[PDB]
């Protein structure tokens, strides 16, 4: 399952493949992997499904408190709590999570969490099992501060490639736009983007 | 001192000149006043460290 | 898996005279087929007329030697500066070896 | 009074209050003048540290202590008790830095400190604190100054004051709002702190004082806490000396 | 009288009364503020007094209405140490519940558990009552506008509208006149702005004291969000009344 | 009343503790000792008290470490527990950080330790003052420990019984003994004159003198017998 | 029990007369896949010290937060906790070392290769090795991982032994560090054309240089050969 988060001028758009695979049985063909931990922080899940579901829920207990008492958390702040959980479960679990979020003093930000407990700020991120086939492709077409439309077109294509080349990627390309505008869900069907 | 009212304060100073008179002095000093206080109280002036 | 015990070679040698004692040992320290350091102490004074050396794998050994150097400090302190004999030291090391018996240490010790 | 109320610190009187916490405050009265002067580009802390005799060493004891590298704190009242609350603040601060990978917000610090004080009124195998603590710094959202009562009450402060000579101190702060409606620059609020503490030493006049001033300012200390010392401090001394006479 | 009694919360009197608990109903008027919470038909409003008595404080930070969670507000009357302390439990139980049961915690369930916890603090004698009245407001995800007031003993009952603070009696009377006279249990507006305006008016009536934006702070729970109005947002409201 | 004198967790109406105040009385009943220092040297001179003349004295100097040490005035059991805790800290510092911990940094840990027993229900308070000396990279330091647990950095102090005449001596000669650096004999000399003045019902002997010295080129060393025969 | 996950490569250092140079690639490889390019791996501690970490990147981060807490710990109290009682590298060195023995003791090590480089506040150069296995030795020519065997001779022509540290000057040291950087780009799969170089000098302090490019590229014997085929 390939997932990604890429900055642009007005914010960050998170993209993903919503296929869930146990072996060569598809567990569910759809169903998001874009999981909110906050209104302006959303997260991307890949790897082991179970691990990745549970870990996010724990994080939401922490960031519920965070918002209530001590202000909004930043994208860094949400990532630092994932980073501790993944660090302490370095030897017990494996989770590949991209943290991206939208700010009123940074705009769109990307910090990716590898399978271990590191933290690595990048302005774009690719991860999962499906990502290892589109690394060369995304690299050519990345540029700084795109318009919203180009960003969307770029993510659509890159994820279609991962389905073409990997069986654990699939179903709809969901996108979560995070902007000053608000939150937009976006969905697209296979018929359109197979061509593109 | 602490919690010594006007009367008491005079009691220690006058008392401290008596003490000095016995020792061989004919004027008061700093140490003698301290000794005046140890009459108001039942504290021992000089005792070895093994309870104080 | 993590094997917590590496190896760092070296050779020390002890000779008891009859009014003097030497603890000697080479300064070559290795990891595989590299020479790490051209000069590496190995016999460390600990005072009271005790030199200690604990050689084999170097991490386990520094740690052994260090815990014993704390043991000198507490020995003076609680005994009103009693000097530690070579036989009392020998037994004392045995307590450090048995206290890391099921976390066994992999050094040949010569004092 | 007796009958609880002042013998135990979780027992309430018919007055709906606890008289031991008033007594906690009284020990603050006995403690010495400390101010914090909020500014629009920093925060300034000054303290009066009295000199008992001249055998004491100059500039080597304080009540200014730092948490992180950007939150200054100073306490007045009982000195060793006041040390331990800041120390407890550090242990708390460290936990925030571990989990969230970021310095503490000053309003985050204000909440955690007030929980620690309030806990020492819930049990009776514990003693309350008997110190106020002026604190604050600069963070994301700018400079913030808070002051904590031994009551476990806090509010934001454009000027905070505690210790014995605080009557003079509060009036001078309010004049400072009126004369400069931005509360003045942090550089000159150091000098302003020296003139305050010297007037506050007319309440403490029987002995000598040592003026220690510290700051943490957005661009005048480059967002970090440092001691105000050397030609900056010498200035404060001189301005203050000039202006009492 | 007193003979042990009042020094403990596990000591009853001849009457079975626990005296120390009654002292916290006297300890919650110690901030001198008064609150008003009212219901409309798409909101609950809760309004408390804002005392900034020294200009040495920042009028911003001053408040006793705290955001507990997305859908839950709360007003605190009584001491600042116990305000924060009750907010900690409330914030925490609200977050834990959310994650335990996966779903948001209603006004009533937050009100219920806070009281039980308080009760256990009266059962035991290493704890004490937190002497605050807490009034939780939410627009429910299933029962619409709601107000639950939690008293320091740990009684809880819902309300149409409620008042708290020392000067409660005059506010009780006003609010009785209002709903009796309508014969409906709520304010009739479907614009939440005029309900905040209406809440304001009642408050001025009941107290006898005209207000300013330095003497009010207003919390508004609407369905699916909560917000505390800033000083300039209140201000707008007052000039609608004064000249309608 | 002094019905606030029944607890350690109960402040009086004036905001005092009686427990900490009675502990000051215990210093006074404890044996006199003088601290002083110079940029390059620090000394404690202490009066070694016997219970009688079949009694062979008592050590008033406990060696904390090779760069630290303390002396006492007041309770002997109390000096013993806090010396154990302080020695652990010196070992700790040396084990984990390769470092001679600063005297003043050391003193904030001992201050807390005291206040632990002040905060808690049970735990005996401490009714001893300790004079702390050490010599690190930041030169000589002198701390005066209180039964409150407060820490005071001075160039010179005295505590115990009849110790006020030694403070009046040091004040006068304050600037004199500081400037003497690289000369331990003189600093040693000064501590003897101070504690001469204290005396009542006592005369200095060889075995009343215990001099503890650390400095620029000196380990923490306690001097006794034939080596204080040059300073009796 | 920590297994290699995300890995770096090699930290390279030497000593000269007035200071030391420590320098490192910027890389974060998962497997053989170069996942991250341009990962900072030198971490200043004050300005008297840089500790450089390669080995596991997750554990670099854990130690990052410990060194940050080291300065905070030092910074508490004293107006003389910063220039007479500034963090000497020897102190820094020991703190890491103690935590490795104990973590190792739990069959759960912080998986790292660590070289601490810096100049004391006594003025004396300190360059020393520490690692996951707790092995401690001081040598003037240090390198880690592959370069411990591989790129360590180059620096040893320069500094043979303990009496060759004075004979080396800043210029000779600085260039020697560059010649070795080429070796690691060329002949270890763990490569990065970026590197960082940090100068710690007694008369200048810490001067940090980020993203220097390797140069003197040699591939023209590649042109010379048609190989076998």
From Swiss-Prot, chain A:
It comes from the Eukaryota. It is an enzyme of class 3 (hydrolase). GO terms for molecular function: endopeptidase activity; threonine-type endopeptidase activity. Pfam families: Proteasome. It catalyses: Cleavage of peptide bonds with very broad specificity. Its EC number is 3.4.25.1. Keywords: Acetylation, Cytoplasm, Hydrolase, Nucleus, Protease, Proteasome, Threonine protease, Zymogen. It is found in: Cytoplasm; Nucleus. Signal peptide: none annotated. Its main location: cytoplasm. The 26S proteasome consists of a 20S proteasome core and two 19S regulatory subunits. The 20S proteasome core is composed of 28 subunits that are arranged in four stacked rings, resulting in a barrel-shaped structure. The two end rings are each formed by seven alpha subunits, and the two central rings are each formed by seven beta subunits. The catalytic chamber with the active sites is on the inside of the barrel. Belongs to the peptidase T1B family. This is Proteasome subunit beta type-1. It comes from Saccharomyces cerevisiae (strain ATCC 204508 / S288c) (Baker's yeast).
From Swiss-Prot, chain C:
The chain holds residues 20 to 130 of 241 of the full protein. It comes from Saccharomyces cerevisiae (strain ATCC 204508 / S288c) (Baker's yeast). Belongs to the peptidase T1B family. This is Proteasome subunit beta type-6. Non-catalytic component of the proteasome which degrades poly-ubiquitinated proteins in the cytoplasm and in the nucleus. It is essential for the regulated turnover of proteins and for the removal of misfolded proteins. The proteasome is a multicatalytic proteinase complex that is characterized by its ability to cleave peptides with Arg, Phe, Tyr, Leu, and Glu adjacent to the leaving group at neutral or slightly basic pH. It has an ATP-dependent proteolytic activity. It is found in: Cytoplasm; Nucleus. The 26S proteasome consists of a 20S proteasome core and two 19S regulatory subunits. The 20S proteasome core is composed of 28 subunits that are arranged in four stacked rings, resulting in a barrel-shaped structure. The two end rings are each formed by seven alpha subunits, and the two central rings are each formed by seven beta subunits. The catalytic chamber with the active sites is on the inside of the barrel.
Curated annotation (Swiss-Prot), chain D:
Its main location: cytoplasm. The gene is PRE10. This is Probable proteasome subunit alpha type-7. The alpha and beta forms are probably products of the same gene with different post-translational modifications. PROSITE patterns: PROTEASOME_ALPHA_1, PROTEASOME_ALPHA_2. One of its GO terms (cellular component) is proteasome storage granule. GO terms for biological process: proteasomal ubiquitin-independent protein catabolic process; proteasome-mediated ubiquitin-dependent protein catabolic process. The keyword Cytoplasm applies. The keyword Nucleus applies. The 26S proteasome consists of a 20S proteasome core and two 19S regulatory subunits. The 20S proteasome core is composed of 28 subunits that are arranged in four stacked rings, resulting in a barrel-shaped structure. The two end rings are each formed by seven alpha subunits, and the two central rings are each formed by seven beta subunits. The catalytic chamber with the active sites is on the inside of the barrel. It comes from the Eukaryota. It is found in: Cytoplasm; Nucleus. Pfam families: Proteasome, Proteasome_A_N. SUPFAM superfamilies: N-terminal nucleophile aminohydrolases (Ntn hydrolases) (SSF56235). Present with 12000 molecules/cell in log phase SD medium. Keywords: Acetylation, Cytoplasm, Nucleus, Proteasome. Belongs to the peptidase T1A family. One of its GO terms (molecular function) is mRNA binding.
From Swiss-Prot, chain G:
One of its GO terms (cellular component) is cytosol. CDD domains: proteasome_beta_type_4. The keyword Cytoplasm applies. It is found in: Cytoplasm; Nucleus. Keywords: Cytoplasm, Nucleus, Proteasome. Its main location: cytoplasm. Non-catalytic component of the proteasome which degrades poly-ubiquitinated proteins in the cytoplasm and in the nucleus. It is essential for the regulated turnover of proteins and for the removal of misfolded proteins. The proteasome is a multicatalytic proteinase complex that is characterized by its ability to cleave peptides with Arg, Phe, Tyr, Leu, and Glu adjacent to the leaving group at neutral or slightly basic pH. It has an ATP-dependent proteolytic activity. PRE3 and PRE4 are necessary for the peptidyl-glutamyl-peptide-hydrolyzing activity. PANTHER family: METALLOPROTEASE TLDD, PROTEASOME SUBUNIT BETA. This is Proteasome subunit beta type-7. It comes from Saccharomyces cerevisiae (strain ATCC 204508 / S288c).
